[PDB]
UniProtKB/Swiss-Prot annotation, chain D:
Name of protein: 26S proteasome regulatory subunit 7 homolog
Biological role: The 26S proteasome is involved in the ATP-dependent degradation of ubiquitinated proteins. The regulatory (or ATPase) complex confers ATP dependency and substrate specificity to the 26S complex.
PTM characteristics: The N-terminus is blocked.
Gene responsible for this protein: RPT1
Included stretch of the parent chain: 95 to 456 of 467
GO biological process: positive regulation of protein catabolic process; positive regulation of RNA polymerase II transcription preinitiation complex assembly; proteasome regulatory particle assembly; proteasome-mediated ubiquitin-dependent protein catabolic process; ubiquitin-dependent protein catabolic process
Organism classification: Eukaryota, Fungi, Dikarya, Ascomycota, Saccharomycotina
Family: Belongs to the AAA ATPase family.
Positions where Phosphoserine occurs in the chain: S38, S105
From Swiss-Prot, chain E:
UniProt name for this protein: 26S proteasome regulatory subunit 8 homolog
Gene designation per UniProt: RPT6
Highest rank taxon of the organism: Eukaryota
Subcellular localization(s) per the UniProt record: Cytoplasm; Nucleus
Segments crossing the lipid bilayer: none
Signal peptide extent: none
Family: Belongs to the AAA ATPase family.
Biological role stated in the UniProt entry: The 26S proteasome is involved in the ATP-dependent degradation of ubiquitinated proteins. The regulatory (or ATPase) complex confers ATP dependency and substrate specificity to the 26S complex.
Additional facts recorded: Present with 4700 molecules/cell in log phase SD medium.
Curated annotation (Swiss-Prot), chain F:
Effect of K10Q: 73% loss of ATPase activity
Gene (name only): RPT2
Coiled-coil stretches: none
Chain positions recorded as ATP binding sites: G4, A5, P6, G7, T8, G9, K10, T11
Stated role: The 26S proteasome is involved in the ATP-dependent degradation of ubiquitinated proteins. The regulatory (or ATPase) complex confers ATP dependency and substrate specificity to the 26S complex. Has ATPase activity.
Location of cross-link Glycyl lysine isopeptide (Lys-Gly) (interchain with G-Cter in ubiquitin): K15, K36, K71
From-to range in the entire protein, with total length: 220 to 436 of 437
Protein name per the record: 26S proteasome regulatory subunit 4 homolog
Location(s), subcellular: Cytoplasm; Nucleus
Protein family: Belongs to the AAA ATPase family.
Curated annotation (Swiss-Prot), chain G:
Sites bearing Phosphothreonine, chain numbering: T58
Gene name linked to the record: PRE6
Protein known as: Proteasome subunit alpha type-4
Extra remark beyond the main annotation: Present with 16800 molecules/cell in log phase SD medium.
UniProt subunit comment: The 26S proteasome consists of a 20S proteasome core and two 19S regulatory subunits. The 20S proteasome core is composed of 28 subunits that are arranged in four stacked rings, resulting in a barrel-shaped structure. The two end rings are each formed by seven alpha subunits, and the two central rings are each formed by seven beta subunits. The catalytic chamber with the active sites is on the inside of the barrel. Interacts with CIC1.
Family membership: Belongs to the peptidase T1A family.
Domain of life: Eukaryota
Protein's cellular compartments: Cytoplasm; Nucleus
Function in brief: The proteasome degrades poly-ubiquitinated proteins in the cytoplasm and in the nucleus. It is essential for the regulated turnover of proteins and for the removal of misfolded proteins. The proteasome is a multicatalytic proteinase complex that is characterized by its ability to cleave peptides with Arg, Phe, Tyr, Leu, and Glu adjacent to the leaving group at neutral or slightly basic pH. It has an ATP-dependent proteolytic activity.
Length: 252, 243, 52, 330, 142, 217, 125, 233, 51, 217
């Protein structure tokens, strides 16, 4: 993964409950076999992209040492016989060969979703794609060292078959962090950036409400424009305040 | 379709322009004003050999010294003709004297705008303005003989000649050269018909034309058909002897 | 639009009922002869085991 | 020597001694990396050459001289000067300012600082008066009119297409003080979603070649390029942008006065009475393109034989209008 | 039975192709006793020119079934079946409403399934009534 | 241009006239060229015109140009570029050919606002011939020919048959004759009554006139 | 609302509602009037293939407006009844105010005004 | 897009101009040009009467509305008529009731409200007409510019109708001369005929169908027509 | 706006009768039957009850 | 970086002007060419740009328009408009992968921006929002001053006047006007441009000046 799973910290609740669903059956399939319950099947990330959404998906894969495999859903839309069948199967086959692996399927409303009404207008290409996903999961085939992860802007948009257990058992939500949560994420973010002793973490956290990892990252870079401007090689309280107020202004 | 508040770029509603197009598809009406008379000719038009003459209106009396010629739809001019008679009658009751050509025209054209569910001290309630233009002629003691062109768009121009129709092109250009300050009433009628036969593609006759004039000698007089035929017959000789 | 008729049907199954009516019609029928007639026509437009 | 693909069927030696250019998708033979110095030769087989597209190999023996790489119709100092050009006044005035006056005085435009329009795009009913109007201005300045048919530029062979475009612009520079009239530009294609739909590769080669030649090194002061289009909204972005297309001209329909004149011009061939007036037919005629006026004229004669006379009266002209204009239903 | 709900351009384009052949045959060949059977029950998206003589020369209407007919179709099919004696087939048919020829075939195979479930080779009138009611529900769907 | 429905209007007049002029009748089905690959419509149009010039006198019949006859308003957003290309190649050859009596072109189509105003080309296509349902007299003639071929009763008249007709196509009259003979052959006999033709007429008319509208009010 | 754009000109100068009106007339029955010079004959079609109705419960083609004024129509039944009611009110009002048995032309002027009226101005079709 | 802010009188823009206001501003220009200039004791309107047909006869297009008031139009003539109609009525009601003679500012305000009520229903409409109103009251001389957009400014000088910018630039320059010249008509009138000739650039100037209108301390409302404009060309 | 949220369907079809009126007729043909018989010693009315 | 506000203000020229100055490769991708009716195609085009961007480095990937592909929906009806959604998404996914880098620059222009997301406010993506509001009067006189620099002049031009009379006019509109001002000067006999020529360019129609003697006699 691009980053480890304790360096994005201040998403910690979501870190915690992704870690025990995904990492543990991959590392230790044995505990789930021994109990006699199924290993987990599918996990869902929902919420706006870049709320630290992308972080959490990259980050679970790093710790396992899985390969993260990004699949564009539209490309799964070939207009030939069984090409569409072929592509899904091959990812599933490769997931078992190169195990452990995360097959990350981004957007499940270019190959799934609930459509216009699920009639025929060119909504059968979409229907063929979803049918394939549903048949492998429900059937004799299964997910064990292939984990599949769905991503969707809002979860209510997904077929209720996908909403059943035996497709997706784990459904994680990504909200706006806590003030405590913002605080932990900022200290991490500002740490790796070189700065003067006179920097005030305390001031920025107080000004920030409704900030995701991305919004903290903007405050560092915005300050940095003022810091080339003020003829320095390091970030200072003067650069920090201005930057924090501007990122606040542009948004709610 | 089209709103009663939806303009073109120039300030002008769709509906107003569109009326003005249908006007031009009517029948040809030509009026020439001098200071010896105003002569009005129209093509009456026979729509069949079994359509009776003088049952179709093209020369109407607003008052006994005041006429109008129409072009467009004939029913649409009826609401105007009604308003014009009423205006004339009322002014004479109140003031015991004649309405001026201008005054009369203004009164009809104020109520030809309208349309929509609007109001501002003017009652507007029409679905469309009228589809018809009329050439309103009269003589008044002060200004004598005058001719006015009424647009149903609430617009009014004072004129000394105007022609409208589908024959407008030939007739206005001919009218400019033919215009003079005074010339005899008999020469003028003969000359009007000459202009009409030119823009007309077919033989001109009295079963599709009616003439009319306005005199200070005896007020609004429709120059009737029998008398008009004898002039058309002279027309055939004078015209094939310039050729 | 309105018309007068000597036998007509309206609502569903106008064609079927009207066709039969024109055929059995008479002008020496009595109330009871009509009822019998009426009851036949109604039967032939309704498909059932029985009509109650 | 035409060759657009050149097998020599396993003449074998070897370093080298096969020296065969195949340009075909199946089999890509590249003899690249600059020079091979040869007196005459790639290899043998009646077919020393380097196809229509060259994988290096700097041109032994004539392979890209091919019999028709031109087929368009040039008319210097056109026949047309006034044909269907009546009541085209707004269109005609634009052509005068854009084309006529810089040709007439190149020095005045230079001194001012401005460029006359590099390109003109002409839309509206096409060839009904459009091509005619273009020929009328050209004749007046004595400027070669070059009429190129969009559809021909659609040859089904390799480059065959890039061949033709190139020689058309070479001709324009030689004969300069001249108009290149392109009827269709959607025959050789503009914007579409059908490049991924697996065929229109041949089309794409032509399109790109065209853009390159024009903007690249064609002088655009006297040499005018005129484009004609059937859908004004289907231009490719390269085509659209200023520096290539400036002036966008409307087709102008013959007006009442204009239609009467065109009526006189076309009846000079016909055998009809001259005592009638053209004007009369025009009042009954509603807004009609130059093509329709011509259609009235052939129809009055068919009417005339039907009514059993060998002259056409006014009355045949009136009937002939009634028939063509209802029939047309546009 | 081979429903597909016509088409405006997927089987109107194909019928045009068919229509040339039929035209060519009426000409020089003059070939008849070579037959095409079409059947369809919609023509508000199918072309009329097929129904014109040259291609389709006769247009015959299918009759609607009746209670009296449903009883016959049942009578033939049950003849292979082992029955319990005292049975009355007109009664079973009358209990049908709307039922087309394929539905009648369903009544025997379901009557028999009910008997099979109870491990009987003989089927009473009562099972047959219960079967028809099931068959009626099938026609009501979609 | 021949407008109407084929087999009864468009097809009959075009076959008939060619036979009269002793010219080669060429029917091409427009839609079928409607091939689904970019580029091959334009080849196919070329071959039509190539054959014509080689093998004149000819009547070129292009049936149903409304699949390749499109001309759209776009080529983006579900726009298909081939369809428009083919329509243009077709048009440019047609306008390239002009004759006084080597080629006359007959078209079939039922919309003209899918076609280019330069594929009409005013001064080429002057004529607009359209099928209607025939007059009483012409209907009399259509009946008269078809009954020649029958053996029939003498209670049958042309006159009686006309009065109950509301103006129909000639194809309905043909269809009526085949249906009628079939009730006569079913009754095992070769006499066709006035009643037989009347039953047959009513029946086809009924199958065609699936839409209905009260017009008397 | 419904006080506007029922009726407006095209830029082609056709009226929608009038153009679809003339079409109801062609579809409907047939009426003709031929004049002598000391008579007027009015002949009418009433067309029904269905024979299960009488003339004495199907409305007449010629309706009396007065004993010496008659009205014939072709078109919708519904609409024609509206027009007929005005013409009888106009006959009796004229007789009352001018004290002359009716002139037939004046009655045309009243029926024709109504017809103009709902076209020119909205709130009625 | 177009259809959002066109015909819809209830809508707004972040800018506050709808399509219906920009068309109205264009409509003013399509009437003939008329220029205004005033001192502090007189107010002048110089207006060109140019016929729009060959046969058409010249008629007044400056209309005296009261003894101490008038207007000239530029733009749409029906639109101009209704407003003039309401203003003549308004003039009377003030004179009978309150004996009040209107200042321009007051009328103006009234004028804005009238347009405003008709831009609050789809069945009414906005106008297409500008007006220059002159009047002389006891606060001196006045010239007002009325706009359909409801922007009313009382100015020393302006022009509306086609090709305004010729005259505006001249009028801003001769400003200082003209405003301090009091009790003398002839110079301000002459200067108005010069202004309007810079508006024209390619359109005729008529030496007997110009019409100049003046109001003031020593001038009750007179329109000089025909002959009587001669000595100011 | 809301001057274009008018259904405009109580205007004529080209078929010689209003849209809404023709469509409404269909609605009748999908509801209960009434039968009217006029006799020479009565009038008989029958109607079949819907549900 | 992200650019927004009306085109023809000189956005496209600034993109190139920045490219020339830094010594970057201008790669122009028109957003409606990427929008294929065929499966998955635009997505592939978006990826091919970025890859070549890295070999060709330093580079500005200039995407003229981002309003055609900006549409991505929020409903379940996304199925249909999948193609536009994937391309927008594809560019953000690839961009975010790195962040120590700036040897590919992405520049987007939007007619006006309509959506905003955390995706569209992150560093290494579109952090930067530069707005292009319509230019001022003072600004128009300088842009005008540039066009007439190429022109030859009589030094009778007054810039100030013309600039106050134009109303939210853009760089493109002004350029065309300078060419019309020169044509007028040709017509008058002049071979140089003065102020009046420009004033006359303003008088011809632009939706606020017009000439006629209509509705006036």
């Amino acid at each position: 993964g691009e980053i480890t799973f304790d360096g994005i910290g201040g998403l910690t609740e979501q870190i915690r409950e992704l870690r025990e669903v995904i990492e543990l059956p991959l590392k230790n399939p044995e505990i789930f076999q021994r109990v006699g319950i199924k290993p987990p099947k599918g996990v869902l990330l929902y919420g706006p992209p870049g709320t630290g959404k992308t972080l959490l998906a990259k980050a679970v894969a790093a710790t396992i040492g899985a390969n993260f495999i990004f699949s564009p859903a539209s490309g799964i839309v070939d207009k030939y016989i069984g090409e569409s069948a072929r592509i899904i199967r091959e990812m599933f086959a490769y997931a078992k060969e190169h195990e452990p692996c995360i097959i990350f399927m981004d957007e499940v409303d270019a190959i799934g979703g609930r459509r216009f009404s699920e009639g025929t207008s060119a909504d059968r290409e979409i229907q063929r794609t979803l049918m394939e996903l549903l048949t492998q999961m429900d059937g004799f085939d299964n997910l064990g060292q292939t984990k599949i992860i769905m991503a969707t802007n809002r979860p209510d948009t997904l077929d209720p078959a996908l909403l059943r257990p035996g497709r997706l058992d784990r459904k994680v939500e990504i909200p706006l962090p806590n003030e405590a949560g913002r605080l932990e994420i900022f200290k991490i973010h500002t740490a790796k950036v070189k700065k003067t002793g006179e920097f005030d973490f305390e001031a920025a956290v107080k000004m920030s409400d409704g900030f995701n990892g991305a919004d903290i990252r903007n405050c560092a870079t915005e300050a940095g424009f003022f810091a080339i401007r003020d003829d320095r090689d390091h970030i200072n309280p003067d650069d920090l305040m201005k930057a924090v107020r501007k990122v606040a202004e542009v948004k709610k | 379709d089209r709103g009663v508040s939806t303009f073109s770029p120039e300030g002008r509603l769709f509906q107003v322009e569109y009326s003005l197009e249908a006007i031009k598809l009517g029948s040809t009406a030509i009026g020439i004003a001098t200071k010896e008379g105003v002569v009005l000719g129209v093509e009456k038009r026979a729509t069949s050999p079994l359509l009776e003459s003088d049952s179709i209106e093209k020369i109407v009396e607003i008052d006994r010294h005041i006429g109008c010629a129409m072009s467009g739809l004939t029913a649409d001019a009826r609401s105007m003709i009604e308003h014009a008679r009423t205006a004339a009658v009322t002014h004479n009751l109140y003031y015991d004297e004649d309405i001026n050509v201008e005054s009369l025209t203004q009164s009809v054209c104020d109520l030809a705008l309208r349309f929509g569910e609007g109001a501002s001290g003017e009652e507007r309630l029409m679905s469309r303005p009228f589809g018809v233009a009329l050439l309103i002629a009269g003589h008044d003691a002060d200004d004598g003989y005058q001719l006015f062109h009424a647009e149903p768009s609430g617009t009014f121009y004072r004129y000394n000649a105007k022609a409208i129709g589908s024959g407008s092109e030939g007739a206005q250009a001919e009218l400019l050269n033919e215009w003079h300050s005074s010339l005899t009433l008999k020469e003028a009628e003969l000359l009007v018909l000459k202009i009409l036969k030119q823009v007309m593609e077919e033989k001109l006759d009295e079963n599709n034309a009616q003439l009319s004039c306005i005199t200070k000698q005896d007020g609004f007089k429709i120059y009737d058909n029998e008398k008009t035929a004898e002039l058309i017959k002279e027309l055939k000789e004078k015209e094939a002897a310039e050729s | 639009n309105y018309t007068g008729w000597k036998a007509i049907s309206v609502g569903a199954n106008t064609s079927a009922a009207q066709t039969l009516l024109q055929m059995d019609y008479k002008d020496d029928m009595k109330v009871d002869d009509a009822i019998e007639l009426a009851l036949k026509t109604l039967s032939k437009t309704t498909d059932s085991s029985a009509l109650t | 020597h035409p060759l657009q693909v050149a097998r020599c069927t396993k003449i074998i030696k070897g370093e080298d001694a096969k020296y065969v250019i195949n340009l075909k998708q199946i089999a890509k033979f590249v003899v690249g990396l600059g020079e091979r110095v040869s007196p005459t030769d790639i290899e043998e087989g009646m077919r020393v050459g380097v196809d229509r597209s060259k994988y290096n190999i700097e041109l032994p023996l004539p392979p890209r001289i091919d019999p028709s790489v031109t087929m368009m119709t040039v008319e210097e100092k056109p026949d047309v000067t006034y044909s269907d050009v009546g009541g085209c006044k707004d269109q005609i005035e634009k052509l005068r300012e854009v084309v006529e006056l810089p040709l007439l005085s190149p020095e005045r435009f230079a001194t001012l600082g401005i460029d006359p329009p590099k390109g003109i795009l002409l839309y509206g009913p096409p060839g009904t008066g459009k091509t005619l109007c273009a020929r009328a201005v050209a004749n007046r300045t004595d400027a070669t009119f070059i009429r190129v048919i969009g559809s021909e530029l659609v040859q089904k062979y390799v480059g065959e297409g890039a061949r033709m475009v190139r020689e058309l612009f070479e001709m324009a520079r030689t004969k300069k003080a001249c108009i290149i009239f392109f009827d269709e530009i959607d025959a050789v294609g503009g914007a579409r979603f059908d490049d991924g739909a697996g065929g229109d590769n041949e089309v794409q080669r032509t399109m790109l070649e065209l853009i390159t030649q024009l903007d690249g090194f064609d002088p655009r002061g006297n040499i005018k390029v005129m484009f004609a289009t059937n859908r004004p909204n289907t231009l490719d972005p390269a085509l659209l942008r200023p520096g290539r297309i400036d002036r966008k001209v409307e087709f102008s329909l013959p007006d009442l006065e204009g239609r009467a004149n065109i009526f006189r011009i076309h009846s000079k061939s016909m055998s009809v009475e001259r005592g009638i007036r053209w004007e009369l037919i025009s009042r009954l005629c509603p807004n009609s393109t130059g093509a329709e006026l011509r259609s009235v004229c052939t129809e009055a004669g068919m009417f005339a034989i039907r009514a059993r006379r060998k002259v056409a009266t006014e009355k045949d002209f009136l009937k002939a209008v009634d028939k063509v204009i209802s029939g047309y239903k546009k | 039975s081979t429903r597909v709900e016509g088409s405006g351009g997927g089987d109107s384009e194909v019928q045009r192709t068919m229509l040339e052949l039929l035209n060519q045959l009426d000409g020089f060949e003059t070939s008849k006793n070579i037959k095409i059977i079409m059947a369809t029950n919609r023509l508000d998206i199918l072309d009329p020119a097929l129904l014109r003589p040259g291609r389709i020369d006769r247009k015959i209407e299918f009759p609607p079934p009746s209670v009296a007919a449903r009883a016959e179709i049942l009578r033939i099919h049950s003849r292979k079946m082992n029955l319990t004696r005292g049975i009355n087939l007109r009664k079973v048919a009358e209990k049908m409403n709307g039922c087309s020829g394929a539905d009648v075939k369903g009544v025997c195979t379901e009557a028999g399934m009910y008997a099979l479930r109870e491990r009987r080779i003989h089927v009473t009138q009562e099972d047959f009534e219960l079967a028809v009611g099931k068959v009626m529900n099938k026609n009501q769907e979609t | 241009i021949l407008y109407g429905a084929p087999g009864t209007g468009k097809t009959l007049l075009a076959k008939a006239v060619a036979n009269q002029t002793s010219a080669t009748f060429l029917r091409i089905v427009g839609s079928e060229l409607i091939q689904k690959y970019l580029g091959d419509g334009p080849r196919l149009c070329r071959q039509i015109f190539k054959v014509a010039g080689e093998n004149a006198p000819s009547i070129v019949f292009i049936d149903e140009i409304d699949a390749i006859g499109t001309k759209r308003y776009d080529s983006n957003s579900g726009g298909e570029r081939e369809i428009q290309r083919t329509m243009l190649e077709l048009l440019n050859q047609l306008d390239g050919f002009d004759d006084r009596g080597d080629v006359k072109v007959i078209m079939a189509t039922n919309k003209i606002e899918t076609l280019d105003p330069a594929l009409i080309r005013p001064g080429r296509i002057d004529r607009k011939i359209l099928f209607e349902n025939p007059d009483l007299s012409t209907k009399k003639k259509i009946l008269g020919i078809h009954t020649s071929k029958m053996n029939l009763s003498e209670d049958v008249n042309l006159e009686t048959l006309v009065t109950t007709k509301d103006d129909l196509s000639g194809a309905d009259i043909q269809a009526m004759c085949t249906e009628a003979g079939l009730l006569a052959l079913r009754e095992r006999r070769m006499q066709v009554t006035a009643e037989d033709f009347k039953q047959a007429k009513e029946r086809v008319m009924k199958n065609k006139v699936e839409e209905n509208l009260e017009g008397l009010y | 609302g419904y006080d506007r754009a029922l009726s407006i000109f095209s830029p082609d100068g056709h009226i929608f509602q009038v153009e679809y009106a003339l079409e109801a007339v062609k579809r409907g029955t047939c009426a003709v009037g031929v004049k002598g010079k000391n008579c007027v004959v009015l002949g009418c079609e009433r067309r029904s293939t269905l024979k299960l109705q009488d003339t004495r419960i199907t409305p007449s083609k010629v309706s009396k407006i007065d004993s010496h004024v008659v009205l014939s129509f072709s078109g919708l039944n519904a609409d024609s009844r509206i027009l007929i009611e005005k013409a009888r009110v106009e006959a009796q009002s004229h007789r009352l105010t001018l004290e002359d048995p009716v002139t037939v032309e004046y009655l045309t002027r009243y029926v024709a005004g109504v017809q103009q009226r709902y076209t020119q101005s909205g709130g009625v079709r | 897009f177009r259809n959002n802010y066109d015909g819809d009188t209830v809508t707004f823009s972040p800018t506050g101009r709808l399509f219906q206001v920009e068309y109205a501003l264009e409509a003013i220009k399509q009437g003939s040009v008329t220029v205004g200039l005033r001192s502090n004791t007189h107010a002048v309107l110089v207006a060109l009467k140019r016929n729009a047909d060959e046969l058409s006869s010249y008629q007044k297009k400056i209309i005296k509305c009261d003894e101490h008031m008038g207007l000239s139009l530029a733009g749409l003539a029906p639109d101009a008529r209704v407003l003039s109609n309401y203003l003549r009525q308004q003039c009377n009601y003030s004179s009978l009731v309150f004996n009040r003679k209107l200042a321009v500012e007051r009328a103006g305000h009234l004028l804005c409200d009238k347009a405003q009520k008709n831009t609050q229903s789809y069945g009414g409409r906005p106008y297409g007409v500008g007006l220059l109103i002159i009047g002389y009251d006891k606060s001196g001389a006045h010239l007002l510019e009325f706009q359909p957009s409801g922007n009313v400014t009382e100015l020393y000088g302006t022009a509306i109708g086609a090709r305004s910018q010729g005259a505006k630039t001249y009028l801003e320059r001769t400003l200082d001369t003209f405003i301090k010249i009091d009790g003398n008509p002839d110079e301000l009138i002459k200067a108005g005929v010069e202004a309007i000739s810079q508006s024209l650039r390619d359109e005729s100037l008529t030496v007997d169908n110009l019409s100049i209108a003046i109001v003031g301390k020593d001038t009750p409302f007179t329109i000089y027509d025909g002959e009587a404009v001669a000595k100011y060309i | 706006g809301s001057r274009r949220y008018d259904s405009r369907t109580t205007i004529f079809s080209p078929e010689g009768r209003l849209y809404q009126v023709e469509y409404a007729l269909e609605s009748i043909s999908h509801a209960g039957t009434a039968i009217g018989i006029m006799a020479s010693d009565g009038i008989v009315l029958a109607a079949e009850r819907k549900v | 970086a992200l650019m927004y506000g009306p085109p023809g203000t000189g956005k496209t020229l600034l993109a190139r002007a920045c490219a020339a100055q830094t010594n970057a490769t201008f790669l122009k991708l028109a957003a409606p060419q990427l929008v294929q009716m065929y499966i998955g195609e635009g997505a592939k085009l978006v990826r091919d740009a970025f890859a070549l961007a890295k070999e060709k480095a330093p580079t500005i990937i200039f995407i003229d328009e981002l309003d055609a592909i900006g549409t991505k929906r929020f409903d379940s009806e996304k199925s249909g408009d999948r193609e536009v959604q994937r391309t927008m998404l594809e560019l953000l996914n690839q961009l975010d992968g790195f962040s120590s880098d700036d040897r590919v620059k992405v520049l987007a222009a939007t007619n006006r921006v309509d959506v905003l997301d955390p995706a569209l406010l992150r560093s290494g993506r579109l952090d930067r929002k530069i707005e292009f509001p319509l230019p001022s009067e003072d600004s128009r006189a300088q842009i005008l001053q540039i066009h007439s620099r190429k022109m030859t002049t009589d030094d009778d031009i007054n810039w100030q006047e013309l600039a106050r009379s134009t109303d939210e006019f853009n760089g493109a509109q002004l350029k065309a006007v300078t060419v019309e001002a020169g044509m007028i000067a040709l017509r008058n006999g002049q071979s140089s441009v003065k102020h009046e020529d420009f004033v006359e360019g303003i008088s011809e129609v632009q939706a606020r000046k017009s000439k006629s003697v209509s509705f006036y006699a």
